[PDB]
Amino acid sequence: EITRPPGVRAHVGVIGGSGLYDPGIVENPVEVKVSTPYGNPSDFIVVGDVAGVKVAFLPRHGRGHRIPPHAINYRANIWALKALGVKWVISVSAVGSLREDYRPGDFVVPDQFIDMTKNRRHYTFYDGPVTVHVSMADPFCEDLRQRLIDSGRRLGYTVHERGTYVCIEGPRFSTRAESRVWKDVFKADIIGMTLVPEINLACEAQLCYATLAMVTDYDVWADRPVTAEEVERVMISNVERARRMLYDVIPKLAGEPELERCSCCRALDTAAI
Amino acid sequence: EITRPPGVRAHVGVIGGSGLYDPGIVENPVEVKVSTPYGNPSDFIVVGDVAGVKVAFLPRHGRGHRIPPHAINYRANIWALKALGVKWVISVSAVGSLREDYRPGDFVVPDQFIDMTKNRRHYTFYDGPVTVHVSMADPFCEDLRQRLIDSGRRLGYTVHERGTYVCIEGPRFSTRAESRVWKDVFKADIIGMTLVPEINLACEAQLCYATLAMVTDYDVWADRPVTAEEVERVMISNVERARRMLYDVIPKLAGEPELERCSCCRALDTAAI
Amino acid sequence: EITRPPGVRAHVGVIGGSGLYDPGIVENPVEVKVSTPYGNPSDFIVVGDVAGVKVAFLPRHGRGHRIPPHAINYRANIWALKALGVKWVISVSAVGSLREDYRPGDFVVPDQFIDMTKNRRHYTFYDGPVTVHVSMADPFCEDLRQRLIDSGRRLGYTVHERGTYVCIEGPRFSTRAESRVWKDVFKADIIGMTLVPEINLACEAQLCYATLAMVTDYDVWADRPVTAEEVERVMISNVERARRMLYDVIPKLAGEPELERCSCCRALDTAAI
Ligand SMILES: CSC[C@H]1O[C@@H](n2cnc3c(N)ncnc32)[C@H](O)[C@@H]1O
Ligand SMILES: CSC[C@H]1O[C@@H](n2cnc3c(N)ncnc32)[C@H](O)[C@@H]1O
Ligand SMILES: CSC[C@H]1O[C@@H](n2cnc3c(N)ncnc32)[C@H](O)[C@@H]1O
């Protein structure tokens, strides 16, 4: 609805996670305020050009990592991106690994998730009177997944092509007994705190959303358990590789997602009562 | 406490789920407002006669399916039914199946549940200073379960005589990875969104509550995953069968539940500290 | 910050659970009000002497068991203990058993937990702008665990030396289908309602916290399922044994926890961003 400055539009949105507070990537950056019915997004959205494509960057934790996962205004964030006209959303996230072969420094492009959050307050945009139940069997946008995998391959980085993300509430990390459940019982591959309800809202807004995850740690399974400082250090050390992948992929997103490879692109057709 | 019109009482309550917004079933219908300490119930309660038994009908989603599962005022709904004097509560619900032999169009009368909700805000009526911990090992009222099973048999419908209901938060449906957990790990039979905390509150109010579930879909396991429109279509197509079962069962509920086959009928005796 | 009376300090904190509303244990008891940014703790804190060590006792449910698990102001409780200067926290709790050999009347000193709560509203003290993710792989303080185990042995009581606690939301007890999940799928040992988020907050405050649990029931697995009255009766019958253990252990806590056996004692060093 209202933006300041007025008239700003973008085509691709990038949501930065741990370690990614600035868009080193955009040219001609303008900071934009976007009105939402839910109040403030995490920070200003930075809009600029990447090889002729207009990109909107939002740090989910705000600049300086000021907002922990449970306190993020997920509704405002996704509303603001949708209001700017974006069709594609790339999320860049730090995750823990629950398997030896998904190693620190590897990328993962997950294809499934399990929601073990509890305190996020709103899991939908739709509280009535139109009841909306989106289908999320295949919750990520395949068109964008495949493009991230291809970019990673071309640049020579390791990119695991599948993975189930278990989303936990936090902010504490898991106990050993919990980690054993995630790994041995649920057979999840990676773990983080921020995917839900971000992905649910992206789907409801009919966006093509995918996650580019970077493994930062092995959860409770190494000699030393994960610490926050380790996650941050690992991300900051590798942010250059994530930036290179974004510069590779974004120019290829000049067009529209293919409907047959975008499960949420027409989610509301069959979902609203 | 206060009702408008004044003096209205009922013996059986029916909570209608998806597809069941009107009580085609009652005669001499009066719309009733019932005061509750929790504000508005989902809609007016309709009170009328079914073969000499006074029945109170409440659509949990409101008329026109205006209230999604996470936004229902469960406390107000159950308080209002209790205030009218009801002893028996039949819930009619749409569920998904996690097993091939529980097929779309079949009825299920579940005997257990697993609560995987997270955002329902109140799971009890008792916040102190009297602490109440009801026993819910066998959470449904057996007297009423057995009567529903018998009615279904007599009318010639398929009624599965047991089943564990996994209650999920929604409003989105499950991912494939989540559905695999419900089915393969938890070994649940059916899935829905509305049972909790409705059943907890019914037990605390010492009501005899049972669910008549209708299978509308196979969750994420068919060629096509579940959509909201499919659930609604399937329910509306079969609502006649549900109405026939209610007309059969309600006249047999002229009496009181048998205490030895009503786990919650004296729940508060041993539960309050 | 502000206390009334002013100037009160304590070294050991004891949080009493079900059945333990008074500190039969302390001498020279003074009731203390401690300001917190979160409002009222469960009750006054009672401060007094046990063989030369200053002890602060707080009943988590308040006197008279007025506050059920979901309504406890966990932040206020832990803030108030920290403000008084305590370094050690002993929690005394009633738990259910999920295994035949952990019998009613036995003590358990758990070493792990699984959090299955959903409605506790705040799981941390840190909502930003400093983001804090504490490591809780080994969530209890080992120094204090070992001292409780030793005391139990010396007095001749059965004390199980390990156990995974599954924390459920309540206030209703588990269904049979849920209990089967806790026992057979998650392989938990004991069950209760109060550990989370108490333990998370204790860790964030850099306290040495451990639980002395008493088994009061076998959950849904005996001839009769658990009832609230049974739990209370069993605790009140055995509170003398718990008091004897506290009198044995507290004089040995005159010193400081050993850092190498206190996982949370420097939790914030690596946890804050
Ligand atoms: C900066 S440390 C906190 C961040 O770590 C991410 N994360 C990385 N490793 C893990 C892990 N092992 N478990 C949970 N979240 C993790 C979470 O999404 C969170 O926002
Ligand atoms: C009208 S579509 C939404 C309703 O479908 C019911 N339901 C039917 N099938 C499923 C399913 N597969 N998973 C979850 N809830 C379902 C839920 O209880 C909800 O209120
Ligand atoms: C006084 S009855 C309620 C208390 O029982 C404790 N508890 C004892 N047995 C169990 C059990 N089987 N399941 C859950 N909590 C239990 C809980 O922590 C709660 O505060």
CB-CB contact of B59 with B41 (8 Å)? no
Backbone dihedral region of C234: left (phi > 0), alpha (psi from -120 to 50 degrees) or beta?
alpha
The Cα–Cα gap between A157 and A108 comes to 11
The nearest alpha carbon in chain C to B269 belongs to C229
The Cα–Cα gap between C194 and C77 comes to 13
Set of chain B residues whose Cβ sits within 8 Å of the Cβ of A124: 68, 70, 170-172
CB-CB contact of A122 with A173 (8 Å)? no
Strands C53-59 and C12-16: parallel
- The answer to whether the CB of A220 is under 6 A from ligand 1 is no
The label of the residue with tokens 């597809």 reads B19
CATH number for the domain running over C1-273 = 3.40.50.1580
CA angle C208, C213, C219 (to 5 degrees): 140
Strands A3-4 and A27-34: antiparallel
Tokens representing A17 are 């996670």
Locate the ligand 3 atom nearest the alpha carbon of residue C69 and give its number: 20
The residue from A22, A49, A219, A269 that is catalytic is A219
* A217 in active site: yes
Residue B246, C-beta contacts closer than 8 angstroms, at least 6 positions apart: B14, B25, B50, B90, B92
- Which of B36, B25, B35, B27 minimizes the C-alpha distance to B5? B35
The Cα–Cα gap between A112 and A188 comes to 9
Over its C-alpha atoms, chain C yields an Rg (Å, rounded) of 18
DSSP single-letter state for residue B120? -
Q: A193 to chain B, minimum CA–CA distance in Å?
A: 16
> Which residues does ligand 3 sit against, CB inside 6 Å?
B 133, 273; C 18, 69, 94-96, 168, 173, 191-194, 216-217, 219, 226, 228, 231-232
Residue B65, C-beta contacts closer than 8 angstroms, at least 6 positions apart: A131, A273, B18, B21, B232
Handedness of CA C218, C222, C225, C230 (dihedral sign): negative
Handedness of CA C42, C44, C47, C48 (dihedral sign): negative
What distances in angstroms separate CA A165 from CA A96, A110, A113, A213, C153, one per listed residue? Answer: 9, 7, 4, 10, 44
The Cα–Cα gap between C121 and C118 comes to 8
Residue in C211, C231, C237, C239 to alter for ligand 3 test, most ligand atoms within 8 A of Cβ: C231
The nearest alpha carbon in chain A to B226 belongs to A135
The nearest alpha carbon in chain C to B203 belongs to C172
Angle between helices C142-155 and C228-249 (to 10 degrees): 90
Q: Which of B64, B185, B232 sits opposite A185 (nearest CB)?
A: B185
3-class DSSP string for chain C: CCEECCCCCCCEEEEECCCCCCCCCCEEEEEEEECCCCCCCCCCEEEEEECCEEEEEEECCCCCCCCCHHHCCHHHHHHHHHHCCCCEEEEEEEEEECCCCCCCCCEECCCEEEEECCCCCCCCCCCCCCCECCCCCCCCCHHHHHHHHHHHHHHCCCEECCCEEEEECCCCCCCHHHHHHHHHHCCCCEEECCHHHHHHHHHHCCCEEEEEEEEEECCCCCCCCCCHHHHHHHHHHHHHHHHHHHHHHHHHHCCCCCHHHCCCCCHHHCCEC
- Probe site for chain B from A98, A111, A115, A185 (most B CB atoms < 10 A): A115
Q: Do C68 and B120 touch (CB under 8 A)?
A: no
Phi, psi (degrees; rounded to nearest 5) at C248:
-75, -40
* C217 in active site: yes
- The answer to whether the CB of A179 is under 6 A from ligand 1 is no
Over its C-alpha atoms, chain A yields an Rg (Å, rounded) of 18
Strands C164-168 and C190-192: parallel
Phi, psi (degrees; rounded to nearest 5) at A159:
-135, 110
Angle between helices B195-204 and B74-83 (to 10 degrees): 40
The Cα–Cα gap between B217 and B103 comes to 8
CB-based burial of residue C4 (10 Å sphere; 0-12 exposed, 13-18 middle, 19+ buried)? Answer: exposed
Count the helices and strands in chain B (H runs, E runs): 5, 12
Task: Please report how many Cα atoms fall inside a 13 Å half-sphere around the Cα of residue B151, on the Cβ side.
Answer: 23
To one decimal, the resolution in angstroms is: 1.6
Number of A/C CB contacts below 8 angstroms equals 105
Number of B/C CB contacts below 8 angstroms equals 105
CB-CB contact of A162 with A107 (8 Å)? no
Could you tell me which residues of C are annotated as the binding site for substrate? 193, 217-219
- Which of A167, A162, A165 minimizes the C-alpha distance to A146? A162
DSSP-based three-state secondary structure for B218 = coil
Tokens representing C151 are 């005391």
The nearest alpha carbon in chain A to B181 belongs to A186
The Cα–Cα gap between C14 and C31 comes to 14
CA dihedral B119, B124, B125, B127 (to 10 degrees): -90
What distances in angstroms separate CA B267 from CA B133, C69, C172, one per listed residue? Answer: 9, 19, 11
Handedness of CA C227, C228, C231, C233 (dihedral sign): negative
- Which of C131, C130, C273, C144 minimizes the C-alpha distance to C202? C144
The label of the residue with tokens 């590897």 reads A106
What distances in angstroms separate CA A63 from CA A22, A40, A68, A215, one per listed residue? Answer: 7, 14, 12, 22
Q: Which of C113, C123, C270 sits opposite A229 (nearest CB)?
A: C270
Residue B209, C-beta contacts closer than 8 angstroms, at least 6 positions apart: B88, B89, B90, B91, B140, B141, B144, B198, B199, B202, B203, B264
What distances in angstroms separate CA B190 from CA B92, B97, B105, B167, C63, one per listed residue? Answer: 14, 5, 13, 9, 43
The Cα–Cα gap between B188 and C35 comes to 48
Tokens representing A214 are 């970077």
Residue type present at position A43: D
The Cα–Cα gap between A71 and C125 comes to 12
- Give per-residue burial for B96-124: e unless 16+ CB within 10 Å, then b: bbbbeebebebbbbbbbbbbbbbbbeebb
The Cα–Cα gap between C259 and B13 comes to 60
The Cα–Cα gap between C4 and C270 comes to 35
The Cα–Cα gap between A269 and B229 comes to 9
Residue type present at position B246: L
DSSP-based three-state secondary structure for B197 = helix
Q: Do A270 and B226 touch (CB under 8 A)?
A: no
Residue C22, C-beta contacts closer than 8 angstroms, at least 6 positions apart: C46, C59, C63
CA angle B233, B235, B240 (to 5 degrees): 120
- What are the extents of the domains in chain A? 1-273
C-alpha B89 – ligand 2 centre gap (Å): 21
- Which of C111, C90, C61 minimizes the C-alpha distance to C231? C61
Over its C-alpha atoms, chain B yields an Rg (Å, rounded) of 18
The Cα–Cα gap between B106 and A138 comes to 27
Q: Do B129 and C177 touch (CB under 8 A)?
A: no
- The answer to whether the CB of A273 is under 6 A from ligand 2 is yes
- Give per-residue burial for A79-107: e unless 16+ CB within 10 Å, then b: bbbbbbebbbbbbbbbbbbbbeebebebb
CB-CB contact of C214 with C92 (8 Å)? yes
Residue type present at position A240: E
The Cα–Cα gap between B82 and A118 comes to 30
- Ligand nearest to the CA of residue A61, numbered in listed order: 1
* Structure determination method: X-ray
Residue C155 CB coordination number (10 Å): 14
The Cα–Cα gap between A208 and A228 comes to 30
Angle between helices B228-249 and B142-155 (to 10 degrees): 90
Residue type present at position A72: I
Start-end of H helices in B156-270: 176-180, 195-204, 228-249
The Cα–Cα gap between A152 and A142 comes to 15
CB-CB contact of B117 with B196 (8 Å)? yes
Residue A153 CB coordination number (10 Å): 12
CB-CB contact of C268 with C134 (8 Å)? yes
DSSP-based three-state secondary structure for B192 = strand
Strands C208-217 and C88-97: parallel
Residue type present at position A112: Q
The Cα–Cα gap between B252 and B263 comes to 20
Tokens representing C138 are 């080994």
The Cα–Cα gap between B124 and B138 comes to 17
Residue B150, C-beta contacts closer than 8 angstroms, at least 6 positions apart: none
Locate the ligand 1 atom nearest the alpha carbon of residue A232 and give its number: 1
CB-CB contact of B235 with B94 (8 Å)? yes
The Cα–Cα gap between B61 and C49 comes to 58
Q: Output the DSSP codes for chain A.
A: --EESTT---SEEEEE-TT--S-TT-EEEEEEEE--TT---SSPEEEEEETTEEEEEEETTTTTT-S-GGG--HHHHHHHHHHTT--EEEEEEEEEESSTTS-TT-EE---EEEEE----S-S-S--SSS-B----SS-S-HHHHHHHHHHHHHHT--EES--EEEEE--SSPPPHHHHHIIIIIS---EEESSHHHHHHHHHHTT-EEEEEEEEEE-TT-SSS---HHHHHHHHHHHHHHHHHHHHHHGGGGSS---GGG-TTTTGGGTTB-
Instruction: Tell me which residues of chain C have a C-beta less than 8 Å from any C-beta of chain A.
Output: 112-115, 117-124, 126-129, 131-139, 164, 185-186, 188, 200, 203-204, 270-273
The residue from C150, C217, C248, C269 that is catalytic is C217
The Cα–Cα gap between C207 and C82 comes to 8
Angle between helices C74-83 and C195-204 (to 10 degrees): 40
Angle between helices A142-155 and A228-249 (to 10 degrees): 90
Q: Do B64 and A133 touch (CB under 8 A)?
A: no
Tokens representing C232 are 């209370």
Length of chain C, in residues: 273
Tokens representing A243 are 């930036």
DSSP-based three-state secondary structure for B185 = helix
CA angle A97, A98, A102 (to 5 degrees): 50
CA angle C183, C185, C191 (to 5 degrees): 35
- Which of B241, B107, B98, B223 minimizes the C-alpha distance to B162? B107
Tokens representing B151 are 């009615």
User: Is position B97 annotated in a ligand binding site?
Assistant: no
Q: A32 to chain C, minimum CA–CA distance in Å?
A: 22
The Cα–Cα gap between A156 and A208 comes to 25
Q: Do C121 and A118 touch (CB under 8 A)?
A: no
Tokens representing B187 are 């070994």
The Cα–Cα gap between C219 and B98 comes to 27
Cis before C69 (ω within 30): no
Q: Do C228 and B118 touch (CB under 8 A)?
A: no
In angstroms, the first-to-last Cα distance of chain C is 25
The Cα–Cα gap between A212 and A235 comes to 13
The Cα–Cα gap between A97 and A95 comes to 7
Residue B240 CB coordination number (10 Å): 10
The Cα–Cα gap between A77 and A91 comes to 12
Q: Do B132 and C174 touch (CB under 8 A)?
A: no
Residue type present at position B258: E
- Which of C36, C74, C17, C81 minimizes the C-alpha distance to C54? C81
